[PDB]
Design a binder for this molecule. Sequence first.
Ligand code: PLM
Ligand code: PLM
Ligand code: PLM
Length: 581
Amino acid sequence: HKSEVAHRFKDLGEENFKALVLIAFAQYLQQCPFEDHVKLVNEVTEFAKTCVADESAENCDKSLHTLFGDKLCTVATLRETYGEMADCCAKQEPERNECFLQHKDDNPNLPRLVRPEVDVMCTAFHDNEETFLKKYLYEIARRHPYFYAPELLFFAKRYKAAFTECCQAADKAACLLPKLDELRDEGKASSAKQRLKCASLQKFGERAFKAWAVARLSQRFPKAEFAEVSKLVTDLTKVHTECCHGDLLECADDRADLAKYICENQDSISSKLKECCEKPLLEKSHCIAEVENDEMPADLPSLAADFVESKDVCKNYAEAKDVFLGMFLYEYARRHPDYSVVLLLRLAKTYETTLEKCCAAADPHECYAKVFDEFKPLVEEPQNLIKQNCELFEQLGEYKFQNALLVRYTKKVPQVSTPTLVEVSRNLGKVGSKCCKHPEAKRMPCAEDYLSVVLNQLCVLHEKTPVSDRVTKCCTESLVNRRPCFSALEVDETYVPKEFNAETFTFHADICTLSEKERQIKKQTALVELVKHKPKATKEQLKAVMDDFAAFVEKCCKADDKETCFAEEGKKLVAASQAAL
Ligand SMILES: CCCCCCCCCCCCCCCC(=O)O
Ligand SMILES: CCCCCCCCCCCCCCCC(=O)O
Ligand SMILES: CCCCCCCCCCCCCCCC(=O)O
């Protein structure tokens, strides 16, 4: 590589290059208007083509960081707007790059992106496809400035694919808004996992990260040897150290090295990787991360022969403890893709705890011969809740199931704000939908994925304005004990029933004109506020107050003079409901 830009432009192509340079600049300079970044992109691009044409041409010998910082420092509004960022420009490059990273603000005071009417978007899409898309790519990019750029680009192409389909359609909103909802969900889910991988590495350490990674890579490449899994977990640990630090260009260099490696040693890693390795430079790593489990080898020995019965277990443990526990977790994991990653680490921590007592003890082989019995119950805890909650989701719909949860959690933690309880109850139910459609074989890894990002979001909102110490306990616990902690919460026996507020239980005639989505949030808020007023109420009592409410609405949204009904029946509903509690 005589020219780094020339090469990236060859490996990426003009279109991909422009998009990535835009995303890159919208991530450092988050307050400049769209049309200034377009001028910048086109000048960086005009210059890249100079180097493609002639590797020896003026300025083509320079580093990507060096060229990037230079173009950043040409902006004249820079001092007046960003201030301290401008002071970086005084430095020489190795120090200067580090300075632009220190002054990258996650979430500035930027207004929420309004979704326009479907009609507005489709007309816009048709009339100038490109500038419609880059303008929206520039908006997401300035708001989520630590969102790895190629993944952001990958989402972009799926928005483009949603409009191409749904603007030439029968009914646009019913086509498009679900596509856009599924995408928004994944963009929010993906942004949470990057945040979470990085918070995990810092708050818990290199050791629990590798543990997590070994469990993971072994479930997915079960035919690979442990030496090979080690090698991948080493390089992945470097990858995330670096990608957390924020240097887009060095983060991208590492992931691609990893994908180049994995595709060459494909033979000795996984059969299900042929497709991902035919894909071009940009997509490779992203694709490999999404790869399916390889099938495990047919008849695989039970583990007690080497980790429980055999002598020289302690003599193997003591030699190198973490590598032997690694040996273990690999072996356990590759036999059990139906387990959550955290289940497997709960087990490996259990085997650790015993080998500590029993290898320092009078008789080793005897003290720990029944260690596998400790597993049995640990395994059944998450399996039972999935048996039980997907039983309940099947009886009631998605929506009525959300209301079971909302009553459950409001009783466990009644101090939490109402919009928050309503929101997480609704997501838990959505997890219900996506995960209960999988068979027992796949349910626990499904939940692990969705619960971890629902639970991370929960602990952030709590960090900001705390509310319960029991919730603070669950959020300042190991990653392995996060979900059992939430699960171990009991109905708050201390909670003082809150003051009845009349207004809270008054319904006007507008809840007939609302959407199904809005109606549900209105009613759901009233259920929370009801469980907060009468915590000590039975499933039959609350089923009765609920059904009285079902008839009351149905009676008033199907009669002449809807409004006087809603205040006259309303008087009656409240008094009768007061009395039955
Ligand atoms: C490839 C080598 C990686 C090393 C893997 C070590 C296996 C560790 C098993 C314990 C899981 C982490 C739980 C620690 C909880 C705690 O510190 O309280
Ligand atoms: C003045 C220079 C501006 C910067 C030039 C564009 C930089 C884009 C680099 C992204 C390359 C992505 C490499 C593949 C890694 C991956 O697959 O995740
Ligand atoms: C701002 C903090 C909000 C706190 C909300 C507390 C409600 C608890 C939610 C727990 C859901 C996790 C699944 C637990 C499974 C179980 O019920 O056993």
